[PDB]
């Protein structure tokens, strides 16, 4: 793991050198915008033109089918010297290892979709109005009662986007004069919501509760930066599970410290609300944390319930305040009615109230599939991140040129994966995420493992001894 | 605390000093091999190629190539963004003592002949002066000031 670092730095330096060399001619053969400033300066997008454009076919692949265990991938064929990949006919059937349907709700199933269609036949796909005006229907009133009695809090609100649920709610809770302490690896919606408020932002080391206390004591003993005024509030923000890393938060230790120093806890659990937990109640049911010890609880309906939107769960007073001062509730358009019927029906299937047993089989299959896959990868020699119970499990690649090689050798043998590189990760740590679904069968996973073994032999990403 | 700036946070992982030295040994071997010459005339080329690249990368360009951080570092060079602006840290000391060591090698192997001694001393003085702790956020006569 030392020669791997040396090779990674060497290859990135080679890319840097060649990109600068080509940029020194491009900006010189332009002498062979009528007073308008350029959209973007030459070096403000260097890695989009010199790194990302080289490996372009590995992203934004169109699909012509529903996002299920198997799907159809359209192929692209650019002619203009690899500038704009445009598509053709003639798809190919691949195995899905890159979508986010953890519980398998992302296609047509025989309970949810028939009820979704008859709600659309009656409410017509949108209300064209906000929730405070004409955007509240019967469906919207029933959805919040369903979310409340599934998350375990006195009250809840539902919004139409999950990025907005962070970036428009955080400004309402804290302002100038307050403090926000954030985990280093929090999502971009949290960071943008924190910047959208006037509060001060400090950060603590990822998932290390002994540094959170060190930051809290130093910030409380000093006060606001130049004028040592007391802080009005402190809010600590964590995530239930971290998808790039695959790991679960140390939530009991965080909640014990926050009570000691009188901070408020904001929990973002979008990759964990349906996936983990014995009855699928998230991280609080798995780690035995009392749900009255967190003040705000947020989630998304995209990863497990096969829909769109987000929610905030808290106390009665919090929700009454938000429904009076929140910009997303006052100014936006309500969540579409056929897209709320989906969440209602998915919660009824999980809770077991559809009069069937499919909701327990889904929860038993997602736990069984991911444990088997993670235990099978580790004995082959791969470096796999994650704890034990997550459904997402990255594989370390480390070398920038091993991203297109891995992706393109998997796709030729009908397996579809996700890879991520530099700008989005640290320099040394490119990886490939694997998302396991409850709709994958046992004889699909054996085929995927057989392909990935061969590809990892060729690329040389078996960094540990086998068994 | 964690760095929170992709433009500098990578410089703390292992293997970076070793790769810095290996690149400079590889460059010397390339200069010797492509155009047969003597060790001194090769260490001079390495010494003066390490000045153009390093000065432009560390002390001339301002800002970051990543646009998420809207423009918060528009007025800072890469050297001034390092370690959040804190002075005389470990990595700053290493980056300061590299041109000094690379100057002695290029002088003792060239027998201190003058045609090259002027250039090899000018490079080192310019490179070391820009890294003084009191030279922070200051531009000379307004050049590269806006």
């Amino acid at each position: 793991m030392y020669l791997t670092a040396v090779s990674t730095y060497f290859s990135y330096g080679l890319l840097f050198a060649f990109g600068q060399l080509r940029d020194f001619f491009r900006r010189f053969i332009d002498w062979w915008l009528q007073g308008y400033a350029p959209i973007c300066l030459g070096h403000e997008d260097f890695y989009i033109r010199r790194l990302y454009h080289r490996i372009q076919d590995c992203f934004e692949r169109p699909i012509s089918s529903a996002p299920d265990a198997w799907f159809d991938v359209v192929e692209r064929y650019s002619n203009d010297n690899n500038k704009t990949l445009k598509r053709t006919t003639k798809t190919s059937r691949c195995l899905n290892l890159g979508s986010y349907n953890y519980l398998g709700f992302g296609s047509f199933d025989e309970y949810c979709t028939p009820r979704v269609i008859e709600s659309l036949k009656k409410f017509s796909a949108s209300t064209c109005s906000s929730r405070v005006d004409a955007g509240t229907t019967s469906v919207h009133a029933e959805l919040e009662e369903c979310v409340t009695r599934f998350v375990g809090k006195p009250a809840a609100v539902v919004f139409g986007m999950g990025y907005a649920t962070n970036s428009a709610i955080i400004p309402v809770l804290i302002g100038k004069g307050g403090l926000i302490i954030s985990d280093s690896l929090n999502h971009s919606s949290i960071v943008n919501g924190a910047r959208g408020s006037g509060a001060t932002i400090r950060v603590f080391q990822h998932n290390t509760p002994s540094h959170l206390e060190r930051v809290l004591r130093e910030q409380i003993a000093e006060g606001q930066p130049r004028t040592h005024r007391p802080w009005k509030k402190i809010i600590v923000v964590v995530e239930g599970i971290y998808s790039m890393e695959g790991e679960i938060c140390h939530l009991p230790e965080v909640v014990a410290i926050c009570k000691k120093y009188k901070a408020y806890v904001y929990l973002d659990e979008a990759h964990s609300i349906g996936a983990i937990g014995k009855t699928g109640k998230g991280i609080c049911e798995l780690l035995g944390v009392d749900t009255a010890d967190v003040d705000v609880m947020m989630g998304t309906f995209t990863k497990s319930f096969g829909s769109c939107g987000g929610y905030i769960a808290g106390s009665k007073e919090l929700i009454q305040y938000l429904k009076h001062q929140c910009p997303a509730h006052l100014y936006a358009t309500s969540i579409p009615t056929p897209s709320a019927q989906q969440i209602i029906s998915a919660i009824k299937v999980i809770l077991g109230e559809d009069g069937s047993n499919r909701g327990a089989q889904k929860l038993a299959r997602i736990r069984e599939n991911s444990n088997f896959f993670r235990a099978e990868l580790q004995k082959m020699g791969f470096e796999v991140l994650g704890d034990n119970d997550s459904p997402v499990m990255p594989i370390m690649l480390y070398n920038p040129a091993k991203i297109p090689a891995f992706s393109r050798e998997c796709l030729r043998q009908k397996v579809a994966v996700v890879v991520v590189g530099f700008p989005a990760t640290p320099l040394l740590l490119a990886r490939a995420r694997i998302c396991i679904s409850a709709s994958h069968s046992r004889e699909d996973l054996i085929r995927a493992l057989k392909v990935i073994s061969k590809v990892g032999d060729l690329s040389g990403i078996k960094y540990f001894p086998a068994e | 605390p964690p760095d929170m700036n992709r433009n500098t946070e990578w410089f703390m992982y292992p293997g970076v000093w070793t790769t810095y030295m290996l690149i400079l040994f590889f460059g010397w071997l390339v200069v010797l091999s492509v155009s047969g010459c003597s060790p001194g005339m090769a260490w001079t080329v390495v010494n003066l190629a390490h000045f153009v690249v390093t000065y432009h990368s560390f002390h001339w360009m301002k800002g970051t190539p990543f646009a998420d951080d809207q423009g918060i570092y528009n007025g800072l060079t890469w050297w001034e963004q390092m370690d959040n602006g804190q002075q005389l840290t470990r990595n700053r000391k290493f980056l300061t003592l590299v041109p000094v060591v690379l100057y002695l090698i290029a002088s003792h192997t060239t027998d201190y002949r003058h045609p090259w001694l002027f250039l090899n001393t000018l490079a080192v003085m310019v490179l070391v002066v820009a890294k003084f702790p009191n030279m922070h956020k200051v531009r000379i006569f307004g050049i590269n000031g806006d």
């Binding site: - | 804190q86 002075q87 003592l97 002695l104």
Partner: peptide
């Protein structure tokens, strides 16, 4: 001449490599 400058520079090296890090003050 050819070995006094080397000592001169070796002195400033050991002066530099002993200082303690610090950060600038506020307003």
């Amino acid at each position: 001449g050819h070995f006094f400058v080397e000592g001169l520079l070796g002195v400033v090296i050991i002066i530099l490599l002993t200082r303690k890090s610090y950060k600038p003050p506020k307003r």
